[PDB]
Amino acid sequence: VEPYKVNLSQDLEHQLQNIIQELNLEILPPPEDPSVPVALNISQRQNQVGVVPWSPPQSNWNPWTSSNIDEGPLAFATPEQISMDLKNELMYQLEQDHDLQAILQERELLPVKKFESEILEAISQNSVVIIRGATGCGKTTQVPQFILDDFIQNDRAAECNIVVTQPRRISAVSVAERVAFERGEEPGKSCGYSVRFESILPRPHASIMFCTVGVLLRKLEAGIRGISHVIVDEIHERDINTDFLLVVLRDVVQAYPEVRIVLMSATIDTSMFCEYFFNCPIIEVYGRTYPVQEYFLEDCIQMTHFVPPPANCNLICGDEYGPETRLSMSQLNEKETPFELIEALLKYIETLNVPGAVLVFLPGWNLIYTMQKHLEMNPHFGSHRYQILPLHSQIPREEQRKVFDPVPVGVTKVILSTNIAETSITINDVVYVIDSCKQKVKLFTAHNNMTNYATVWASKTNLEQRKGRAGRVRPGFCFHLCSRARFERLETHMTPEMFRTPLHEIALSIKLLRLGGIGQFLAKAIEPPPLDAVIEAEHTLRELDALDANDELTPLGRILAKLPIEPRFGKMMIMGCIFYVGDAICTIAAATCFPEPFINEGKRLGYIHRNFAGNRFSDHVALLSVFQAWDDARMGGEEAEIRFCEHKRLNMATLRMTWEAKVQLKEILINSGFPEDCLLTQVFTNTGPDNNLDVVISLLAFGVYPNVCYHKEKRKILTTEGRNALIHKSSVNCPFSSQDMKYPSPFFVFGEKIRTRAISAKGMTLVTPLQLLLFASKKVQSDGQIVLVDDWIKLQISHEAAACITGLRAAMEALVVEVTKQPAIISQLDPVNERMLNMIRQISRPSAAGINLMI
Ligand SMILES: Cc1cccnc1-c1csc(C(=O)Nc2cc(Cl)cc(NS(C)(=O)=O)c2)c1
Numbered sequence: 112v113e114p115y116k117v118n119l120s121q122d123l124e125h126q127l128q129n130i131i132q133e134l135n136l137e138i139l140p141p142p143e144d145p146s147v148p149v150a151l152n153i154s155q156r157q158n159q160v161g162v163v164p165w166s167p168p169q170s171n172w173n174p175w176t177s178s179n180i181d182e183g184p185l186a187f188a189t190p191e192q193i194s195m196d197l198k199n200e201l202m203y204q205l206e207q208d209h210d211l212q213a214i215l216q217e218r219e220l221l222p223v224k225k226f227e228s229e230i231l232e233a234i235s236q237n238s239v240v241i242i243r244g245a246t247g248c249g250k251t252t253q254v255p256q257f258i259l260d261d262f263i264q265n266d267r268a269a270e271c272n273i274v275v276t277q278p279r280r281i282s283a284v285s286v287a288e289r290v291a292f293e294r295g296e297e298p299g300k301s302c303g304y305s306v307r308f309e310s311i312l313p314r315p316h317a318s319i320m321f322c323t324v325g326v327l328l329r330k331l332e333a334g335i336r337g338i339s340h341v342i343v344d345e346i347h348e349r350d351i352n353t354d355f356l357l358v359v360l361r362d363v364v365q366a367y368p369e370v371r372i373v374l375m376s377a378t379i380d381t382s383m384f385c386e387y388f389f390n391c392p393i394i395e396v397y398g399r400t401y402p403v404q405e406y407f408l409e410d411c412i413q414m415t416h417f418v419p420p421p422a423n424c425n426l427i428c429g430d431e432y433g434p435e436t437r438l439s440m441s442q443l444n445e446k447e448t449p450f451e452l453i454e455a456l457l458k459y460i461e462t463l464n465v466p467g468a469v470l471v472f473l474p475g476w477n478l479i480y481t482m483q484k485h486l487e488m489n490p491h492f493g494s495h496r497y498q499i500l501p502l503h504s505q506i507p508r509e510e511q512r513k514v515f516d517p518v519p520v521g522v523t524k525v526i527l528s529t530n531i532a533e534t535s536i537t538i539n540d541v542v543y544v545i546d547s548c549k550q551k552v553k554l555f556t557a558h559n560n561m562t563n564y565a566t567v568w569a570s571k572t573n574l575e576q577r578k579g580r581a582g583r584v585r586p587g588f589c590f591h592l593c594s595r596a597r598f599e600r601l602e603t604h605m606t607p608e609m610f611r612t613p614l615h616e617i618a619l620s621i622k623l624l625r626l627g628g629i630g631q632f633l634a635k636a637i638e639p640p641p642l643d644a645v646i647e648a649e650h651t652l653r654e655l656d657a658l659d660a661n662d663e664l665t666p667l668g669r670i671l672a673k674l675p676i677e678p679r680f681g682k683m684m685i686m687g688c689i690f691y692v693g694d695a696i697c698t699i700a701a702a703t704c705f706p707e708p709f710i711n712e713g714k715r716l717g718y719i720h721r722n723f724a725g726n727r728f729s730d731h732v733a734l735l736s737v738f739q740a741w742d743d744a745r746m747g748g749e750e751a752e753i754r755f756c757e758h759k760r761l762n763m764a765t766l767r768m769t770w771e772a773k774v775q776l777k778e779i780l781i782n783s784g785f786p787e788d789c790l791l792t793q794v795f796t797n798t799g800p801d802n803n804l805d806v807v808i809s810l811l812a813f814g815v816y817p818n819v820c821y822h823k824e825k826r827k828i829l830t831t832e833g834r835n836a837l838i839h840k841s842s843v844n845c846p847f848s849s850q851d852m853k854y855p856s857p858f859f860v861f862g863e864k865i866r867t868r869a870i871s872a873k874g875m876t877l878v879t880p881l882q883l884l885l886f887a888s889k890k891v892q893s894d895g896q897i898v899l900v901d902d903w904i905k906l907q908i909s910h911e912a913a914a915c916i917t918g919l920r921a922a923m924e925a926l927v928v929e930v931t932k933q934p935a936i937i938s939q940l941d942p943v944n945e946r947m948l949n950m951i952r953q954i955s956r957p958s959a960a961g962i963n964l965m966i
Pocket residue numbers: 174175176177274305310312320321322326327330331333334335336337338
C-alpha cells in the first residue's frame with residue numbers, strides 16, 4: 112500500500128536533532144542516489160562443566176525457605192526428638208481419627224500397595240529407580256507417602272525431605288491437596304506445593320514439596336540443600352523442562368551417589384531412560400484391567416445410523432461395512448471434531464444399559480466449551496438424565512474435584528476433558544471413552560513469529576492409553592473418531608517438546624546455574640534438541656544483550672534468568688523501572704501468564720468491557736483499567752470484590768493470581784537493586800492525556816515485537832511478513848458487523864498470532880509511527896524522502912527524525928546496559944540521560960504524531 116504520512120511539528124523535529132547532538136551521535140547522511148538506501152539502524156571470560164551441588168537433610172536447615180531455624184521448637188532440637196515427635200503425632204492421629212482410618216483403608220486397595228516393600232527396597236539400595244506401571248495404580252499419590260512413612264515408622268523422620276516434580280501447574284497443586292487429604296491435613300503440614308506465582312510451603316522436616324520443574328530450577332542457584340529424595344513424575348509425557356532436569360540430576364547422581372532419584376512413568380518403553388541412568392532397576396506395577404472393545408469412525412457412524420449435515424482418510428473406507436456408512440463418513444472434514452456424532456454416541460451408550468461415566472477427549476478450552484453448550488441446548492442432556500463436567504487446566508479447583516464425585520443413580524457423568532485425563536489423573540466409574548484422536552500443541556516458528564495453537568493428530572501410544580481409561584472398572588468401550596485408513600497414517604510416538612520448543616529460557620537457566628556451554632550441555636540431553644533451535648536461542652539472547660559475544664551471562668541476562676517470564680518481557684520491565692512505570696509494566700507482564708480476566712463466552716465485548724479501553728484503542732489499557740477499578744473495589748472487603756467482579760463480568764480468581772504474580776515480579780526487581788519508588792502503583796486516566804500511560808504503550812510495543820501490523824478496512828490487517836490477517840473477535844479494536852472504527856493510527860502491536868483457518872492478532876494496542884520506529888522495529892532503510900521499516904512498511908517522514916528516533920533506541924539500550932550493572936543509579940541519572948528519557952516521553956505522546964484521541 113502507499114506510504115503513511117507522519118506530520119512531525121518543526122519544534123519536535125529540532126528537539127530530536129538537539130538531543131542526538133548532545134548525546135554525541137551523528138545523523139547518518141542521506142543516500143547519493145535513492146536507488147541505494149542507507150540503513151539508519153545502529154567480556155573475555157569462559158565457563159567449564161560444573162555440577163549442581165547436593166547435601167542431605169539437617170535438623171536446623173529449612174530446605175523450602177533455604178534458611179536456618181533460629182526461633183521455634185526445632186531451633187536447636189535434636190534429630191532424635193523430631194523423629195519421635197512426628198512418629199508419636201502420626202501414631203496418635205491414626206488411632207484417634209476414624210475418618211482417616213476409612214481413607215487409610217481405601218489407600219491399601221490401590222494396585223501399587225502390594226509392591227510397597229519392593230519399591231522401598233529398590234530406592235534404599237540404588238541411586239536412580241524407574242517405577243513403571245499403568246495409569247491409576249497410584250504411583251503419584253502413594254510412592255512419596257510410602258517413602259515418608261517408611262522414614263517416620265523407623266525413627267528417621269528428620270532424615271527425609273522429598274521433592275516431587277509435575278509437568279503441569281494443576282497437577283502439582285491437585286496432588287498436593289489430594290495427598291494432604293490422604294493424611295487428614297491441609298497443605299502446610301508434611302505436604303506443600305510451589306508453582307509459578309503461588310506456594311504453600313510445607314513444614315521443615317518429614318515433608319513432601321510438590322512443584323513444577325521451572326520453580327525447582329529457579330531455586331537451584333544455591334543448590335539441592337536438605338533433600339533426601341527427588342521424585343520426577345510423568346517422565347513419559349516428555350515435558351521439555353523435565354527432559355532438561357534429567358540432564359542436571361544425572362550429573363548430581365554421579366558426583367553425589369547418596370542422593371535418591373525416583374523416575375515414575377506410564378506403560379511405555381523406558382529403556383531410553385534406563386540406559387541414560389546407568390541401567391537402573393525398573394519396578395513393574397500393575398492391577399486388574401478389562402479388555403476394551405475399540406471402535407473407529409466407521410463403527411461409530413454404523414452403530415448410530417448417523418448422517419452428517421450438508422490426504423483425506425474419510426474418502427477411504429473398509430469394504431466390509433455398509434454402503435451408507437461409506438457415503439456418510441465421506442462428508443466429514445477430518446480437520447473438525449464430529450460434535451453431532453458424539454451427541455449420537457452418548458444416546459447409543461444409554462441403549463447398552465450398563466451404568467458408567469463417559470470420558471470424552473477433546474483438544475483445548477475452545478472445543479470443550481463448544482461441546483457443552485451444544486448438548487445443554489438439547490433438553491434431553493439436562494440435570495434430570497446427564498451431568499456434564501468440563502476438565503481442563505483453566506477451571507477452578509472447586510469444579511475440577513467434581514469429576515471424582517459419584518452422581519445420583521439413573522444419571523450419566525460425561526467428562527469433557529483434555530489430555531490431562533490421559534496419564535496425569537484417573538477418574539473412577541469410567542466404562543466409556545469417546546476419543547477425538549487430536550492433540551493441541553504450542554508450535555512456534557521464529558522466522559515470522561507465529562504462535563500456532565494447531566489441532567494435530569495423536570499417536571498410537573495416545574489412542575492406546577486413552578482406550579485404557581475405559582478398562583479400570585469393567586469391560587469398557589472406546590470410540591475413536593478417526594478412520595481405519597487414518598490409524599495407519601499416525602506416528603507411533605509424539606514429537607518430544609525438546610524438538611519443537613524455543614530454548615532461550617533453558618539457555619539462561621544453563622548459564623545462571625553455571626553448567627557450561629548452552630550447546631555443550633544440551634548435547635548431553637537424553638534426546639538432544641535441533642541445532643537450529645540452539646543457534647536461534649543463542650542469537651535471541653545476544654540480541655537482547657542477555658549474553659555477550661563469548662555467550663556469557665551479562666548483568667542484564669542475570670536479571671532476565673531470575674524473572675519467571677519471557678526474557679523480552681523481562682527487559683521491558685527493567686526499562687519500565689528506568690521510566691518509573693514499573694508497576695504498570697509488571698501488571699502487563701503478569702497478565703500474559705494467565706487467561707484474559709474478561710468473561711466474554713465467545714460473543715463480542717459488551718459496553719462494560721469496551722468502556723475499560725477508553726479512547727486508547729488498547730486491550731492492554733483495558734486490562735490495566737480493570738486492575739485499577741478492581742484494586743479500588745477490594746478496599747470494601749471480599750464481598751464487595753465478588754459483587755464488582757460479577758457486575759462487570761470479571762474472573763475474580765484470574766485478577767488475584769495476576770496481582771500476586773505482579774508482587775513476586777516486583778519482589779525480584781527490588782532484590783536486584785531497583786528502588787521501590789520506581790515500582791509504586793500510579794493513578795492514570797484511559798481518556799484524559801496521561802504521559803505515564805504513553806510511555807507504558809511505548810515499552811509494550813518493545814515487549815510484543817516483532818508482533819506489529821497495519822489496518823486495511825473493517826477487520827482485515829496485514830502482518831510483519833506482508834500477509835493479510837484478521838483482528839480477533841475478543842479485542843476492543845474489533846468492530847461490529849456494520850459500524851467501521853476510525854482509528855487515529857492504522858498501526859498496532861499485539862500479544863500473539865492465534866492461527867485458525869487464517870492469521871488472527873489477539874491483545875491489540877494502537878501505536879503512533881514514532882513508537883513504531885523507536886521500539887517496534889529493527890531494520891530502517893531511508894532513501895531521503897521515504898523510509899522502509901523491516902521491509903514491509905513505508906513512511907513519508909523526515910530523514911533526520913527517522914535517524915534521530917533510531918538514535919534514541921541505541922541511546923536507550925546503551926542506558927539499560929549501564930543501569931543493569933548497578934540498578935540503584937536510575938534515581939540519580941546523568942542530565943543528558945534524563946533529557947534522552949524526556950525525549951522518549953515526548954515522542955510517546957499521541958500529540959507528537961499529530962493525533963488527538965479525545966476527538
Ligand atoms: C515463601 C518463602 C519465604 C522465604 C523464602 N522462600 C520462600 C519460597 C517461596 S516459593 C519457595 C520454594 O519453591 N522453595 C523450594 C522449592 C523446591 Cl521444589 C525445592 C526447594 N529446596 S532445594 C533449593 O531444592 O533445596 C525449595 C520458597
